Paper text:
Attempts to crystallize this intriguing [name] tetramer eventually resulted in a 2.9-Å crystal structure. Interestingly, [name] formed a dimer of dimers, wherein the distinctive, V-shaped dimerization interface of one dimer inserted between catalytic domains of a second dimer, forming a symmetric tetramer. Tetramerization orients catalytic domains such that ubiquitin-binding sites face outward and are accessible to solvent. Blocking loops 1 and 2, regulatory elements that line the C terminus of a bound ubiquitin (Clerici et al., 2014), are pried open by direct interactions with the insertion stalk provided by the second dimer. Importantly, we found that the tetramer was autoinhibited. The AIM spans across the ubiquitin-binding site at the connection between the Palm and Fingers subdomains. In particular, Pro521 and Phe522 rest deeply within the USP core, and this interaction acts as a wedge that pushes the α5 helix away from the catalytic domain, e.g., when compared to apo and Ub-PA-bound states of [name]. We conclude that [name] forms an autoinhibited dimer of dimers, in which the insertion not only performs the key underlying dimerization role but also acts, via its AIM, as a regulatory element.
The evolutionarily related deubiquitinating enzymes (DUBs) [name] and [name] comprise an identical overall domain architecture but are functionally non-redundant: [name] stabilizes c-MYC and other nuclear proteins, and [name] regulates inflammatory TRAF signaling. [name] and [name] share an identical domain structure and highly homologous catalytic domains. USP catalytic domains are usually around 350 amino acids (aa) in length; however, in [name]/28, the catalytic domains span ∼550 aa due to a large, conserved insertion of unknown function at a common insertion point between USP boxes 4 and 5 (Ye et al., 2009). Active enzymes form distinctively shaped dimers, with a dimerizing insertion spatially separating independently active catalytic domains.
Numbering used by the authors:
A (entry chain B), D (entry chain B): 158 to 205, 216 to 251, 262 to 287, 292 to 345, 359 to 471, 515 to 671, 674 to 701
B (entry chain A), C (entry chain A): 158 to 205, 217 to 251, 260 to 287, 292 to 345, 359 to 470, 515 to 672, 674 to 702
């Protein structure tokens, strides 16, 4: 009808019903992985228990979003089916999908596609009882705590050390889902609050450092940064001694105090006590309106001339010494920061790259708040903001604004990377008359469904 | 009837109906003036729009004087004033009706409304606009004032009467003096007229001896003085700032601090190489746990021991001089402030006191906001917050918390002072049998019967 | 001789020689204790390093008692203490010499130095380290204290005596009680031990009834209480902060403010199109110069009049509820604070007063800084700042300005209290002819002749 | 001797004697213009009065700086000669040079090179007496006041309007010297102080807008920005109404107050009165450690259910409306700023470009402070910091740090641009055996001087 149409070659919106905004985010992100909807659109329950109605509804939904000419579709049928908190709410959906696909596998020798896609394996090391510890687990979504961390690697390197037992990556799923937990108990409020420390994550993540293959050097490098950090702090402490220099409560840069004392000393002395009161052509390097150097009250009274040379010598040589000291300390600090940055930049460490595919963001109170998600359109190679009906050509800058941290009252609660060395997640199969060719990516039952809905919409337009 | 009765010997509240919060403030403030209530209750129109409103108002007054219910309703009377509706005009119409009605009560000689005597007076002018002299007297009911950039009410009044270098002068002042305080000033950063929230101090008792023509010469002799004094004072302030914010560059520091810091930097032990690197009973005056004297890193590399004495001498004597200069300038500035405060403190200038009777306060946007009032209970000698139903034994501290501004969203938009040299405004006259007001006995018999009928109906309403 | 004489009946200053600013503070503070001066001036070594220093010290005392010069020089005596030099030890050595010398004045029975009685006492312990009990008594001259994160001196003493969940208890206390206040704490941001500049309040009079073993049961019963009380109080504070800093996001605002602002936003008139675009005598209660009611731009586009009453009702009742909640919680918190203050206020706990006699204060780096002292003149009942030559009638306000900290670079490093239940520390004994100390007549004849010779020499020095 | 040698192909330092730092700055900048030292090194006083000794000393100095193997030379002989405040001190030097070259011209028909290089002509318009005003002047160094100005063009456009008479450029010297005056009377101090507002200037300056040729449109454009500015402010005022919205003294963003009120309303109601008190596998999109939604004290007590839908509808629709309003206002403001930026970007306005050659900077008190200067080495195309002896390979970033404004207690007091369409200022003449070839750029007397000094230095090295 009026502005309800879907623009050509544009993403389909999801209707929000009863605060279902979280469902739209997770569903639009999972649909966007091409491999996943090729995996679920080609799904018929084997004839050979509540997973099947929801699953069929989800499949019908996927076809509608994929093929409809409507700006947005309604997930209400599928949303109502998931009946049995938002965490466990998503958990039930995922559980249903993994077990429903579990049923589909037949014959062979007793793996499900989804556990391939979202799960892997990781190691362990001895606990503090004097006994070595070795174990492996599925670790589907890796949780992370954003307590005083600046980037994602600080977060991971802390979430994997867990006391001086360290985990290590053995098997990596093609899609890697990180959780970012902003909830920390606030004493000043006496309630668990979402901390608003900004956390940086990159568009592409090199996971080579956290896998066991290179383990030998990573700690052999980790230790080093520790040493380096135990060095770096020293400099900082020394440098602050130059920037915040003072006996008492108020501290000023030492160069400033030296310069100001020298200016006071060289100021014209005032023996008198306080509280006793056409166009001119210009030379190229002359200073106009230079104020007359009459005495002002702050200058010293006695001013021995012999001493003045002492004061100038002492203070200027010391000020130059201090300037060079500070510049050397800052150069050293900067180069240490540089080495720490790029010590993982060697070619052996850049072998495994995971590209960011989705970020799910949440605003408001913990129990109830708005949810939306940024995803990557690979064809146009553009970021897209999905928020219920609205799907917009967002940019990585609006992405960083909403998702990163203490910007504009928002936070990213989940990151979804995909491996770049395995492109089958985005690949589309040959149509054989030219690939995915849109609507013709679905089996005939969905085809007739979407065509009937589109003809109904054409009648509705009048 | 449950928790709706009036506690014994307590003021009564006014029901808030259709945003009557402003009307409750104005009415409670005017009623608590005892002379006014006595003027209103003793009022009969000569049988031979104001008359309906006025009878409803006198009935309201009798009710609120003698009721047993915790709050009465002005709905009947408030409905009578019919013409984001403007409240200033609405407030004006009640006044206008009242003193026109009291004006209608004239007999004998043509001249003498009681009201105009109570709330208006007259004041002088002068003329310098065309070099032509100007002398005029006007009526100045409720003198307006602007609070922009003013600390106390005296500053505000001086500015409100100078009005360009034509000065006004007080000649006749009513016993009830009403000052308007207008904070509405156009904010450029918003393109809208905002209520500026500068704190404005007013006293519990105001002496206007400076402002009447009787002492006009002296105030003019004295005002000029403070100007000179002020023009002098700023000089000191300027120089004092030089000591407190001393620096060539963008960051400025107290000069004594820079001297002490530099000196103790020179005193520190030179450090080379830059960046590269039971219970012990205590003596009565011993420092405990002092840090060692290891040469820290920020210190001069080479110090001539002979030149260090030069440095100590000069910096110590300079720091002492600066300390003495700053303390002298501060004593001088404090002295000037004290003289400016006490300038009008002499006996000749302390003879017309005006006690603060009420203040009317506002909270919110100009067009639509909340209103309440603070009124002095003279018998118990306590401030009382009148806000709709709620009548409370407030304190002058909560007064300044709401009235002054800069505190929450509260502002004081009107100040009603009463003169102290005539207490007939608060006199309750005398009843011979009691050996004074004796509360409810003041009202006439018609109001008396009314209040008793309401009281008996409330009795019936209580039982259940 | 020009402006170097002592004004009549005035204290004398001490010359600063080779950084003796600390020595002047300690010496003026100890001398002004009258009992101490009387003990020192009446001292003869038994003829039958401390003896030279001590005679020089008694000569210094006599000079400064009876001189006519504005300041005497401790250079002779200060030179005697020979061993960025440490001052804590330097201060210790003088004490040590003094009470060893006074210890040498024993006759008859083996036991009883006057000094140790004056500056030391004894205190209990308890033991929980190994589950094994511990009871011990030590001598605790000049009890040390740490000022880290403490508001008053009672907090400081409680912390300095709990020392882990082993608590100390006072059994014998000297009439002169010296507390050390150590601000030296390692600053991580600088890698250096810095003097933390938290303000620390101390009173002019200290009641230690809580700290002696006599009332140990009750303080233990009461301390636990405040803990509970404190543990309760924080709860309220937590909840109160929720009202004052209410927000899901990074920016938090008072909840009453958000409610009022949102309500008055809904009240505003809807504005469409977004971005695209004589003297008038005043009535007594009229708003003047109110801004017009033009619909400004930030306002809801479409408002259902029926739903606006819902909105007004809910937001007004919620704002009133929040106001009452906040005022109730604030009254409760204030109540708890008052009870914690008055907990020790009962008569049983107010019986051992200690008047603040002196405070020794420091300014600058730990190793090298400036020292001066504040000492009470009991006769004139006024605080007096003793700083080298300069002796001034300071006030307790300048005291708190220098001693408390957080003010300039000043810190208070030692507190010397004296007991009030025995005034023999300030008694001047009696002279029969005068019908008391009568100033200089206290000193013995040798010191007397000395002071008179100096005075006559000063007479000769004056003439010119 | 020890570290006094000059590195090969490196700039020569100037010795500081008696606070001559300003002299080093001005002299090193004037020497750097190639044309100028080709103009003064080829100078002999005509045999045919104090200008000549100083001039010869300056010429000998130039040869020494140009040819010496010493790290730095002493200008003391030349500095002492200028005897007769720093403004007038520079004025005397310039005056001496202009008149000394004035003498050199012979025959012809009664122009001096220096007045060509540093001076030009500008126009005027009627004063406020009802009478038209037309005039022209030499205007050597154009003064400028940096009172509340962000860039150099705001400064120039204000210094040329001078009341609603406007100046206009008729003749432009190849080198253009601007003065930046930071001195303004400070009432809080009662003394003239150097204001520390940062002022931006560009590496290249298009002067096409301030010349008379295009005058007709420049005002025709100036007026427009005025209109645009008189429009732009409106939006800003409107936008602040959204960002700082409040009755009283404390004002918060309106979106924040709406969101917070909605959260409070939807919070669980508390009828009770205040102050009355292995590793688990993770679902990919589940939120771990979500805090339990137990009541907290701030929630409302009565909560009519019917009204709650009212509150949600009202507040969320209003919050979305406000968000869209603010985004539209910000888009409009940004595009207006863009048009104002690039309205002078048309090709007709980019015809005249002046490249920055030097900036002279000063720190400290007005009467006496340190002076140094940044210049452009065109051969290496690198910025260089000249500060007495030290000549260093500075960068435009250290340039912006010291020179621009309220960074690190420094200010630029003079700008020296050179025209780019006239490169003869940097061109060097053909040596004819290969151009300037360094030392061989000077006449033989200077040649023998520098060679003798270099041999003396070689003897001195031992």
């Amino acid at each position: 009808p009026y502005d309800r149409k879907r623009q050509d070659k544009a993403p389909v919106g999801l209707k929000n019903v009863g605060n279902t905004c979280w469902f739209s985010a997770v569903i639009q992100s999972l649909f966007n992985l091409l491999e996943f909807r090729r995996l679920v659109l080609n799904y018929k329950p084997p004839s050979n228990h509540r997973n099947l109605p929801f699953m069929r509804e989800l499949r019908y939904l996927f076809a509608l979003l994929v093929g409809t000419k409507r700006k947005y579709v309604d997930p209400s049928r599928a949303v109502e089916i998931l009946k049995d908190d938002v965490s466990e709410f998503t958990h039930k959906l995922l559980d249903w999908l993994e077990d429903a696909f579990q049923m589909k596998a037949e014959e062979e020798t007793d793996k499900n596609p989804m556990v391939e896609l979202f799960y892997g394996r990781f190691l362990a090391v001895g606990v503090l009882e004097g006994k070595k510890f070795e174990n492996t687990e599925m670790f589907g979504q890796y949780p992370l705590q954003v307590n005083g961390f600046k980037d994602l690697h600080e977060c991971l390197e802390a979430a994997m050390i867990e006391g001086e037992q360290e985990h290590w990556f053995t098997e990596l799923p093609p899609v890697l889902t990180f959780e970012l937990s902003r909830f920390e108990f606030n004493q000043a409020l006496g309630r668990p609050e979402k901390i608003h420390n900004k956390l940086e994550f990159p568009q592409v993540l090199y996971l080579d450092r956290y896998m066991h293959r290179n383990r030998e050097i990573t700690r052999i490098k980790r230790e080093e940064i520790k040493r380096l950090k135990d060095y770096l702090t020293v400099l900082q402490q020394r440098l602050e001694r130059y920037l915040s220099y003072g006996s008492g409560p108020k501290r000023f840069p030492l160069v400033d105090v030296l310069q100001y004392a020298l200016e006071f000393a060289s100021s014209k002395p005032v023996c008198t006590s306080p509280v006793d009161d056409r166009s001119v052509i210009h030379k190229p390097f002359t200073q106009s309106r230079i104020p007359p150097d009459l005495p002002m009250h702050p200058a010293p009274r006695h001013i021995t001339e012999e001493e003045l040379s002492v004061l100038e010598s002492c203070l200027h040589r010391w000020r130059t010494e201090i300037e060079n000291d500070t510049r050397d300390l800052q150069e050293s600090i900067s180069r240490i920061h540089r080495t720490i940055e790029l010590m993982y930049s060697d070619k052996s460490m850049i072998q495994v790259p995971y590209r960011l595919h989705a970020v799910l963001v949440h605003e408001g109170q913990a129990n109830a708040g708005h949810y939306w998600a940024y995803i990557f359109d690979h064809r146009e190679s553009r970021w897209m903001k999905y928020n219920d009906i609205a799907v917009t050509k967002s940019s990585w800058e609006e992405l960083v604004r909403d998702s990163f941290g203490g910007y504009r009252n928002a936070s990213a609660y989940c990151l979804m990377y995909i491996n770049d060395k395995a492109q089958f997640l985005i690949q589309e199969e040959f149509n054989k008359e030219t690939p995915l060719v849109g609507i013709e990516t679905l089996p005939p039952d969905l085809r007739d469904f979407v065509e009937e809905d589109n003809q109904r919409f054409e009648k509705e337009l009048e």
